Curated annotation (Swiss-Prot), chains A, B:
Disulfide bonds join 507-523. Keywords: ATP-binding, Cell membrane, Disulfide bond, Glycoprotein, Lipid transport, Membrane, Mitochondrion, Nucleotide-binding, Phosphoprotein, Translocase, Transmembrane, Transmembrane helix, Transport. Specifically inhibited by the fungal toxin fumitremorgin C and Ko143. The lineage of its organism: Eukaryota, Metazoa, Chordata, Craniata, Vertebrata. The chain crosses the membrane at residues 311-331, 344-364, 393-413, 422-442, 451-471, 546-566. Glycans are attached at residue 511. Changing residue 397 to K/I/M/Y: No change in ATPase activity. Residues 304-566 form the ABC transmembrane type-2 domain. SMART domains: AAA. This is Broad substrate specificity ATP-binding cassette transporter ABCG2. N-glycosylated. Glycosylation-deficient ABCG2 is normally expressed and functional. Phosphorylated. It regulates the localization to the plasma membrane, the homooligomerization and therefore, the activity of the transporter. Broad substrate specificity ATP-dependent transporter of the ATP-binding cassette (ABC) family that actively extrudes a wide variety of physiological compounds, dietary toxins and xenobiotics from cells. Involved in porphyrin homeostasis, mediating the export of protoporphyrin IX (PPIX) from both mitochondria to cytosol and cytosol to extracellular space, it also functions in the cellular export of heme. Also mediates the efflux of sphingosine-1-P from cells. Acts as a urate exporter functioning in both renal and extrarenal urate excretion. GO terms for biological process: biotin transport; cellular detoxification; export across plasma membrane; organic anion transport; renal urate salt excretion; riboflavin transport; sphingolipid biosynthetic process; transepithelial transport.
Length: 569, 569
């Protein structure tokens, strides 16, 4: 099988050392890593799996007599403590996704289906193959079945070496025993299993083949688990009956010293033998389009399977549209036309902007899953970005603009032409895309959602002040005027005003005989636009969409560069 | 000491029964309640402590031979699974609060200080008496010390009977052993301790005096913990060595049936004896002002000790004020005066309204603590309400109005009089109070903050539409006009407009010789007000503050009635 031999490890993580001097050999079977919570057990596991940065590593990890290959992460499985499976998807769907992106595309779909069937049969999930996994807060298969599902996702590719972080934490005692019996059955086949656990039971402990006890980043013991109790008893720490030996081992460390125990081990017979053995030993699959298609498919299934959020936004949009159509019904070309028109346009623009602060959750929620799957070799950092946008961003943001315009444009009696209807729709869509893109840029590469939401809201109100309606931008002083070019709402609102007010007359029965509206009237739409600082040329309408497009590109590029330089280790 | 004898309990919680037929006697010592998670162990604990509604209870709880007194909850302590201590306060401060509200006011402060010193010495917290407890996510004393602090808060009043829900869950093994040794020391004094635990160790289990095993709402065993293993072994379920007997007992239930075990117990020698014994046995301190003072003091200390949130809001307010003063600097009485004035007033009003959706967290965050302390007899439901308002609501909402007005009123060149400055300040303060009150009304008596925040934002935008600026309320149709009287921003904005536009002239060099501004000019402020639908009489300014005050009263009363009828059991 495989023999993962680590020798003289020292990891320095501010320069702290969480693993000091750890050497051992993990032969095939069911190997273990025990110790207190603060001990470097998960850290050692990651070090052996190469899921940790090589910066601090100061030792030689050597598998089956040769240095670790570059494709080790891809050829070896790793199971997370908290399952990352997609609740909205069916078990077989998740297994199909993993098979699609990990296994070679040369394999035909029939062969992959056979492989998935084999794995499902082995884990014993055949009954619940076609059932939704569930969020573990939402209803679905049981927690043990979710854990089995994760194990299967990693088992698709026939891994020789398999790592497991806390396989039994949060599971019930019966479920935990079931999981570990399953792992023992897997190990009898020759697959080397390496895992870390917390507070095991003697029924569990009786199944181990090797034991690695860690405390405060030091090696208290490495050897067969059966002989560990004899070793400690020989050291003088006698054990009482009806006491789980694992608890006794932890108790010795707790003191109910550490360097003394480490030296005792160094003088053991299990250390010189291990030294002799170690001295003897020492001296992308898939194309870009495939990744994009599958990640987009998974995202769309997640969107449909959990429709509570999207449906609510659609409902709110429709209700607001029907209310606004009734309130502003029958806009008139009289003294009060200007106020109502400007007000409705302002409201639509700001509603499109402030409703886009819900895009911060697009990447924040799925951060751990993204990191795990990138390290495991599922996909590139580009395909994830493009697919997630194409699935979760384009349609949701493209809908509200269409709904609003179709509902309100003819109830309100706005311009009766077709050239203007689609300009309005396009303008609103671009505003929404730009605002959502700015949200992604700020919120990308973060795990906390609160701060990003606060920042987004503050920035948007500051932008909204510098829109035309509230301040008359021609009045603002020079040393603060330039801030208006950094406003998303300004461009959209200006475009809508240019589209609507060009041609209207708001003076009933002027008769223009004296030709004098008293110069303080605002009798015509063009006069209002010029007094507001807007340009009546056609370029004045499109120099706003140009800016919105450029802002979209800039923000999306920033978000990509933030995901690409994120720390994934 | 005390002998809490329960007999023939049946609790029906939709009519489900989670406790079927449970009888037992809990003599002085260190008694226990074990079983699986789904078993009614916490439910039984609450039933014995009277923290559960008497509706479902169908049995006789009898303490020391007499029915439970009405003041039982006050004379008996109860410790929650998740500690509710205030992190922002020092240990001694929390103990002082509990002593102030639980112990009689007749006791002098010197005696109470001596009592607190005794308790601190007993628990062994003397070293960390003057250290902040911490949130357990923020730095502070260790988790074990927080648990000891809770135990002390309950131990202030010298309870004869003491209840503990999961005293050791989340604690480290060494810390758990320390806590339980402390409880054993307390029990040797004659105090009857009753507690529920999960997955104990044999070191812990060796300390028990009585055992009560529950599974699926049925009594598997009640008797001395020492004899339990012999009982089960006699039943045929032999036990292996190096296995914790608690785990063996749970394993028997897991099956690695229940009615069979219950019948076996009914035929036991520990059941007839208990029946014989049971048959033998059967056949506000403080004034309102004190409560208000102390709850307000605690709230203020919590506000100062965690200043990250308040400081940020103050900073945002100041920054916005200084930006707005620069943008709108030197308002002129010309064609563009009306727009800028109306815009700034609108912005200030809506900023005061939308910034008050952060008040939903005032009561949502401290819901569990409020319920626990009300049931324990700390305070009334009125004193908590008034004190929490007086501490957390009045100052925070009263500051921003003052800051905004003082900064901007003279930079913008608004009315140069004093009568108007304070009208503006008062108007803004009332708007903020009314909006925050409406937030409290909706969010009161809830544990989830998301839904309330969404509702608040939606209601506020709907209100903002019906303000004067965007819609010209004189245009709206009759069957929808009446919705304007339910708008908080409308009243404030109308008041500010009435205060500012009354007397201004926005037509430079009219010369009024022909006396014709063309009737479409809006040459004067009064003309703008009347065209907007506002009343120029002085009553038109104050009929808005009257409405705001009435809304404040209505919403606060609603919130109180929602807290008073909340389910606390
Ligand atoms: C339109 C008034 C105002 O622009 C202002 O000038 O003062 C401050 C402020 C405003 C609007 C909004 N907010 C504010 O703080 C928060 C907010 C949330 C909104 C939401 C909820 N977002 C947080 C996504 C909507 O769905 C639609 C419109 C929304 N409008 C606003
Ligand atoms: N990236 C890091 N930065 C700083 N300290 C770290 C980092 N990774 C580990 N450590 C430290 O190394 C020590 C070991 O932590 P460790 O990972 O082993 O926790 P664990 O409880 O044993 O893991 P698990 O519960 O998942 O099995 C800790 O003190 C931890 O703070
Ligand atoms: N107010 C309630 N409404 C509905 N069901 C309830 C209520 N209180 C308890 N139950 C039910 O009674 C059963 C027992 O739950 P229980 O309180 O004992 O959980 P527990 O794990 O044992 O408590 P703990 O962990 O804190 O020690 C559960 O099925 C629970 O859903
Ligand atoms: C760099 C980051 C922070 C994003 C900021 C980009 C902003 C400031 C840039 C991006 C593209 C720019 C626009 C590009 C084209 C023109 C047309 C010109 O006739 C007027 C200015 C205008 C309208 C620019 C204004 C500033 C602008 C909107
Ligand atoms: C239960 C909730 C919705 C409370 C909101 C109640 C509102 C609708 C009530 C409370 C007090 C009321 C005001 C009381 C006094 C007057 C003066 C009168 O000359 C005009 C109406 C006006 C201004 C009322 C309008 C409606 C009003 C503001």
């Amino acid at each position: 099988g495989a023999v993962l031999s680590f020798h003289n490890i020292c990891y320095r993580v501010v320069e702290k050392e969480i693993l000091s001097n750890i050497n051992g050999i993990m032969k095939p079977g069911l190997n273990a890593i025990l110790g207190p919570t603060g001990g470097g057990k998960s850290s050692l596991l990651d070090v052996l799996a190469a899921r940790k940065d090589p910066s601090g590593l100061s030792g030689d990890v050597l598998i089956n007599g040769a240095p670790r290959p570059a494709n080790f992460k891809c050829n070896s499985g790793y199971v997370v403590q908290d399952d990352v499976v997609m609740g909205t998807l069916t078990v077989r769907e998740n297994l199909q996704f993993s098979a699609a992106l990990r296994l070679a595309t040369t394999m035909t779909n029939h062969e992959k289906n056979e492989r998935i069937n084999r794995v499902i049969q082995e884990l014993g999930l055949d009954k619940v193959a076609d059932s939704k996994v569930g969020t573990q807060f939402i209803r679905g298969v049981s927690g043990g079945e979710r854990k089995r599902t994760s194990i299967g996702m990693e088992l698709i590719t026939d891994p020789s070496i398999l790592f497991l972080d806390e396989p039994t934490t949060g599971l019930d005692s019966s479920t935990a025993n079931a999981v570990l019996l399953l792992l023992k059955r897997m190990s009898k086949q020759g697959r080397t299993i390496i895992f870390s656990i917390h507070q095991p039971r003697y029924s569990i402990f009786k199944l181990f083949d090797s034991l690695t006890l860690l405390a405060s980043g030091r090696l208290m013991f490495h050897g067969p688990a059966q002989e560990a109790l004899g070793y400690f008893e020989s050291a003088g720490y006698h054990c009482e009956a009806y006491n789980n030996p694992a608890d006794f081992f932890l108790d010795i460390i707790n003191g109910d010293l550490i360097e003394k125990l480490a030296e005792i081990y160094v003088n053991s017979s299990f250390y010189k033998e291990t030294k002799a053995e170690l001295h003897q030993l020492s001296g992308y699959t898939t194309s870009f389009c495939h990744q994009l298609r599958w990640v987009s498919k998974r995202s769309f299934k997640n969107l449909l399977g959990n429709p509570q959020a999207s449906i609510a936004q659609i409902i709110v949009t429709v209700v607001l549209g029907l209310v606004i159509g009734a309130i502003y019904f029958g806009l008139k070309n009289d003294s009060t036309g200007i106020q109502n028109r400007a007000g409705v346009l302002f409201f639509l623009t700001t509603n499109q902007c402030f409703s886009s602060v819900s895009a911060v959750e697009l990447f924040v929620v799925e951060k751990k899953l993204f990191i795990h799957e990138y390290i495991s070799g599922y996909y590139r950092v580009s395909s994830y970005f493009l697919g997630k946008l194409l699935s979760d961003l384009l349609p949701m943001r493209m809908l509200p603009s269409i709904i609003f315009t179709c509902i309100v444009y003819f109830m309100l009696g706005l311009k009766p032409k077709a050239d203007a209807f689609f300009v309005m729709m396009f303008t609103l869509m671009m505003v929404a895309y730009s605002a959502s893109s700015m949200a992604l840029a700020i919120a990308a590469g973060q795990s906390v959602v609160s701060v990003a939401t606060l920042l987004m809201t503050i920035c948007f109100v500051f932008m909204m002040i510098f829109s035309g309606l509230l301040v008359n931008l021609t009045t603002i002083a020079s040393w603060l005027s330039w801030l208006q070019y950094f406003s998303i709402p300004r461009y959209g609102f200006t475009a809508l005003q240019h589209n609507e007010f060009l041609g209207q007359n708001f003076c009933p029965g002027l008769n223009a005989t004296g030709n004098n509206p008293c110069n303080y009237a605002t009798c015509t739409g063009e006069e209002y636009l010029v007094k507001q600082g807007i340009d009546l040329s056609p370029w004045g309408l499109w120099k706003n969409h140009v800016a919105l497009a450029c802002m979209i590109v800039i923000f999306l590029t920033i978000a990509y560069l933030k995901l690409l330089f994120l720390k994934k280790y």
